[PDB]
Write a protein that holds these residues in place. Structure first.
Motif, PDB file in Angstrom:
ATOM      1  N   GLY A   2       0.761  -1.010  -0.048  1.00  0.00           N
ATOM      2  CA  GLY A   2      -0.045  -0.089   0.002  1.00  0.00           C
ATOM      3  C   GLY A   2       0.737   1.233   0.127  1.00  0.00           C
ATOM      4  O   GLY A   2       1.799   1.178  -0.410  1.00  0.00           O
ATOM      5  N   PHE A   3       0.163   2.234   0.451  1.00  0.00           N
ATOM      6  CA  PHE A   3       0.986   3.631   0.652  1.00  0.00           C
ATOM      7  C   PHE A   3       1.148   4.019   2.207  1.00  0.00           C
ATOM      8  O   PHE A   3       0.353   3.792   2.815  1.00  0.00           O
ATOM      9  N   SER A   4       1.932   5.090   2.263  1.00  0.00           N
ATOM     10  CA  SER A   4       2.230   5.385   3.600  1.00  0.00           C
ATOM     11  C   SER A   4       1.619   6.905   3.793  1.00  0.00           C
ATOM     12  O   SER A   4       1.714   7.765   2.593  1.00  0.00           O
ATOM     13  N   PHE A   5       1.008   7.114   5.028  1.00  0.00           N
ATOM     14  CA  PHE A   5       0.454   8.603   5.148  1.00  0.00           C
ATOM     15  C   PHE A   5       0.346   8.869   6.609  1.00  0.00           C
ATOM     16  O   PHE A   5       0.921   9.821   7.021  1.00  0.00           O
TER      17      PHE A   5
END
Lengths: 5, 135, 132, 5
Positions: A2-5
């Motif tokens: 996934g992605f980091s936030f």
């Protein structure tokens, strides 16, 4: 994974 | 410093930013968003289309569409807290690909916790649909 | 089949929206989200309400009389925790006015206590003419 | 409470 936030 | 845990509207708008940004710059790295149980669909042949699953099938599908010089005009983004710490995202905007017509669309995202790390999400569902192919 | 579940719900959700919008509240729980177009005093899309108590109150205040719907596309898939997302595209007419195109997204969650029972965890309705 | 299948 996934992605980091 | 440490910041409060963000609202879905923030999570579901930073993702939309990163999604179309990557779609324009490095569309081959778009598959990093997905997992083994992720779904993906676009439509257009020939009976719109059926979904694909997994990072391998989704990546091969993305490369088949040739996202070159991709420009998106995001108009409205809805992001609500869905079941079990998830974030449902509805996107409404315009999309131009390969220097062609600007096309209106709607898109539904489902962001789920990786488990795994500090507040990181991955795409569980990706539903894209051009309006000119429906109405 | 997530495809069948989501599409039969769309039929039920819009048949009920026309026949008895006052009975539409039973689709939602106390953690459900609901928004059905609209704009602010500034002119920007309205916020969403939460919980069957507030969702019902909002539906009644929208005054659904002789709702008409031509569903043009329903795509239903599976999410985490046996859930089902439904993307809806079509046209809606309220109070016998003109058909307005819309973009909708449902999230069907398992009810938990009864077999094959689903409730609406999320309802995101948007008119296209108020966004585009 | 919701719709059934």
């Amino acid at each position: 994974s996934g992605f980091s936030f | 410093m440490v910041m409060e845990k963000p609202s879905p509207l923030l999570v579901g708008r930073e993702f939309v930013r990163q999604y179309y940004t990557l779609l324009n710059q490095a569309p081959d790295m778009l598959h990093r968003f997905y997992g083994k149980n992720s779904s993906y669909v676009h439509g257009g042949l020939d009976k719109p289309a059926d979904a694909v699953y997994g990072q391998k099938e989704i990546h091969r599908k993305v490369m088949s569409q040739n996202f070159t010089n991709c420009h998106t005009k995001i108009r409205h983004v809805d992001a609500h807290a869905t079941l079990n710490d998830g974030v449902v995202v509805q996107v409404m905007g315009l999309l131009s690909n390969n220097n062609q017509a600007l096309r209106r669309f709607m898109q539904t995202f489902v962001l789920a916790p990786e488990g795994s790390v500090a507040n990181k999400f991955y795409v569980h569902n990706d539903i894209f649909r051009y309006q000119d192919e429906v109405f």
